[PDB]
Design a protein around this nucleic acid. Structure first.
Length: 184
RNA sequence: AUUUU
């Protein structure tokens, strides 16, 4: 277990960077990918903060992916560069789709300003497949305590949004669809 | 060029 859990964290992080949600908004990455038919050096990858926190060891990152479930990433011949499989292009961002991403967006208020992505990640663990967590922030770049969660499907969004209890382990939360939130 | 580069 504990090792397998960690190798999965490694995978999911790399897969989030190159994911459908994050890549379109990742100028640094979008750039790197243009320099070599999409390949990016693990030497530059270990630079990413959240990945680095887990490991800076190239082989470890390679075993972790070699054994992925999403199978969205590609490892190079010399096992030093990785990339998003060309056979898995990014979506055609249409209005029908920009709209559907909104319907899958939920707002939650009541998170201790001193909570981290892993605190929020942990709590969401068994509440539905999520594609993105947005920690809202002030001007001083501080965590407002409120966030935006994007789920993989409306079904799990609606199930979530429509659950009574919804208390953050002791505290109580405000849970609305990103849409309503703008009744402000 | 770290708002999960």
């Amino acid at each position: 277990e504990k090792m397998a859990a960690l190798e999965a964290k490694i995978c999911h992080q790399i897969e989030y960077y190159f994911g459908d949600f994050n890549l379109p908004r990742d100028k640094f990455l979008k750039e790197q990918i243009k320099l070599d038919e999409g390949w990016v050096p693990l030497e530059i990858m270990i630079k990413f903060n959240r990945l680095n926190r887990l490991t800076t060891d190239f082989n470890v990152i390679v075993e972790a992916l070699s054994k992925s479930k999403a199978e969205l990433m590609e490892i190079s011949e010399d096992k030093t560069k990785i990339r998003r499989s060309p056979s898995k292009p990014l979506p055609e961002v249409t209005d029908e789709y920009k709209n559907d991403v909104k319907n899958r967006s939920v707002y939650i208020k009541g998170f201790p300003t001193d909570a981290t992505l892993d605190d929020i990640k942990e709590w969401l663990e068994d509440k539905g497949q999520v594609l993105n967590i947005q920690m809202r922030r002030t001007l001083h770049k501080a965590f407002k305590g409120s966030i935006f969660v994007v789920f993989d499907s409306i079904e799990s969004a609606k199930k979530f949004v429509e659950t009574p209890g919804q208390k953050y382990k002791e505290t109580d939360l405000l849970i609305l669809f990103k849409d309503d939130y703008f009744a402000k």
